[PDB]
Design a protein around this ligand. Structure first.
Ligand SMILES: [C]=C1O[C](O[C]2[C]([C][O])O[C]([O])[C]([O])[C]2[O])[C]([O])[C]([O])[C]1[N][C]1[C]=C([C]=O)/C(=O/[C]2O[C]([C][O])[C](O[C]3O[C]([C][O])[C]([O])[C]([O])[C]3[O])[C]([O])[C]2[O])[C]([O])[C]1[O]
Ligand SMILES: [Ca+2]
Ligand SMILES: [Cl-]
Length: 496
């Protein structure tokens, strides 16, 4: 539940949003294993309805029609092969469990599903599971529309239909047992844990009854009595009836205040300043660090779905995005999840992108493979942020400094900020519109360190900036506000 189950000393997961199972296994072997990534959150592995208007949106995968492992990402054999191949190189797989609902209630009856199962959403018939009309919450919901009309009433957000999706009656043992069996089939293949989708739309105790039915992890890869890692998706920015803390007994919770506040601070909106990040973490009103899964953006709010709104930084704001991700990866708070996206054509009318439905790169509906270019970037409009040097090297810095205290904070009173992590890593940021020239106490042994944002340590040299720290730990840093990446990070393993 709160222990991530990563191989020892791997501290981040990557969401490889809409990637095919064959591409994720090859990425585990050629890249994620070698570069120290802890694991991968994958898209929903179970069968979904095919949505033709608009043509194949990313969100049709959030409309279950059975628990068959049969999707545009692949079939069951390809899924099992990906989970074996990643586990064997020390990279864990986390499944997005869509267990609150089936598909939308106005979807058409038939076999337009990703594996050909039949369903009749209007009569609530899902013969491939099987579910029937008494496995849903239509009678339990008291609103006129049957949907969630107010997030100020706990009963309607848990018992009514979220954007018209058929709401499962999770208090019944039948539904509980049907979901537990799907999830145990996944654990047996070798999955390490689950993102529980739309946890806010389910009662904490029904989630707990499902969790109590789950198997220990597969001992080919995991220790004796290991329990699945669980993180629950609950959007709680405040101001509503449901709080994150109601879900803390079940496992970790998505802290959505983290990317909303960080975005604002880094964009310097509302009078926010990077020097205010001195007390970042619970000091800013976030949940306990041991309960939180943290991220700058997720698949929903990078395209304006969910919540986060305008301050969320994404790959579209690359320079500011890298300083937000570098700060998140250097700070001790939370378990970190990094985003990996595909590019879509945005079209804003009245400040909203009306193209936020567009699904993954595809050729007439079949998802295009991730091609790797000679310069290690991806092709086919996969943007592969997890492969950007600055992000790549900061997931490594987090593994090097794991368990080290926040130390040696400095700020210039405005937007230049620096801090270390024990005597093992130090990062300095300049988000002011003038330059930085300070001699800072780093806490590291004296020596020449390669900056891992502008470069790499290759043999006995650096490809980028070289920082000398003197015998007492201080080092002079100079960073222009016009720099490519306005921040420098050095750690025990980038010492020459
Ligand atoms: C998204 C989200 O949502 C919600 O959140 C909320 C928001 C919005 O409303 O707001 C705020 O304020 C609050 O607070 C919050 O809470 C919920 O909660 C969550 O959970 C979500 N997220 C999640 C979930 C889901 C489901 O599964 C998803 O979603 C997606 O998908 C869907 C389905 O497909 C869609 O929808 C669609 O379809 C439908 C049918 O049924 C219709 O109706 C519509 O229109 C369409 O669109 C949506 O949209 C999407 O988003 C997600 O992804 C996850 O993550
Ligand atoms: Ca529900
Ligand atoms: Cl999430």
């Amino acid at each position: 539940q709160y222990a991530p189950q990563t191989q020892s000393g791997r501290t981040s997961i990557v969401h490889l949003f809409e990637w095919r199972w064959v591409d994720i296994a090859l990425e585990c072997e050629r890249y994620l294993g070698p570069k120290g990534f802890g694991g991968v959150q994958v898209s929903p592995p179970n069968e979904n309805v095919v949505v033709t208007n608009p043509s194949r949106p990313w969100w049709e995968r959030y409309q279950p029609v059975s628990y068959k492992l049969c999707t545009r990402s692949g079939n069951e054999n390809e899924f099992r092969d990906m989970v074996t191949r990643c586990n064997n190189v020390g990279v864990r797989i986390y499944v997005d469990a869509v267990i609150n609902h089936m598909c939308g209630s106005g979807a058409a009856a038939g076999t337009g599903t990703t594996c050909g199962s039949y369903c009749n959403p209007g009569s609530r018939e899902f013969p491939a599971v099987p579910y029937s009309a008494w496995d849903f919450n239509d009678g339990k919901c008291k609103t006129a529309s049957g949907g969630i009309e107010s997030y100020n009433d706990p009963y309607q957000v848990r018992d009514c239909q979220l954007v018209g999706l058929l709401d499962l009656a999770l208090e019944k043992d039948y539904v509980r047992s049907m979901i537990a069996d799907y999830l145990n089939k996944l654990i047996d293949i070798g999955v390490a844990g689950f993102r529980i989708d739309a946890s806010k739309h389910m009662w904490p105790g029904d989630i707990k009854a499902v969790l109590d039915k789950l198997h220990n992890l597969n001992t080919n890869w995991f220790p004796a009595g290991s329990r699945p890692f669980i993180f629950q998706e609950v959007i709680d920015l405040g101001g509503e009836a449901i709080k994150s803390s109601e879900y803390f007994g079940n496992g970790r919770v998505t802290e959505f205040k983290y990317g909303a506040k960080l975005g604002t601070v880094v964009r310097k909106w509302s009078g926010e300043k990077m020097s205010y990040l001195k007390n970042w973490g619970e000091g800013w009103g976030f949940m306990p660090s041991d309960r939180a899964l943290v991220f700058v953006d997720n698949h929903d709010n990078q395209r304006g779905h969910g919540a986060g709104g305008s301050s969320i930084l994404t790959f579209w704001d690359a320079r500011l995005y890298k300083v937000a991700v570098g700060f998140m990866l250097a700070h001790p708070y939370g378990f970190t999840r990094v985003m990996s996206s595909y590019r879509w054509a945005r079209n804003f009318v009245n400040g909203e992108d009306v193209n936020d439905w567009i699904g993954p790169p595809n050729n007439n509906g079949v998802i295009k493979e991730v091609t790797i270019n000679a310069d290690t970037t991806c092709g086919n409009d996969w943007v592969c942020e997890h492969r950007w040097r600055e992000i790549r090297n900061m997931v490594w810095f987090r593994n090097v400094v794991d368990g080290e205290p926040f130390a040696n904070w400095w700020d210039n009173g405005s937007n230049q900020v620096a801090f270390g992590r024990g005597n093992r890593g130090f990062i300095v940021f300049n988000n002011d519109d003038w330059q930085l020239s300070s001699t800072l106490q780093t806490g590291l042994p004296g020596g020449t360190y390669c900056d891992v944002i502008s470069g790499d340590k290759v043999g006995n040299s650096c490809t980028g900036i070289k920082v000398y720290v003197s015998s007492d730990g201080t080092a002079q840093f100079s960073i222009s506000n016009s720099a490519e990446d306005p921040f420098i990070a050095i750690h025990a393993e980038s010492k020459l």
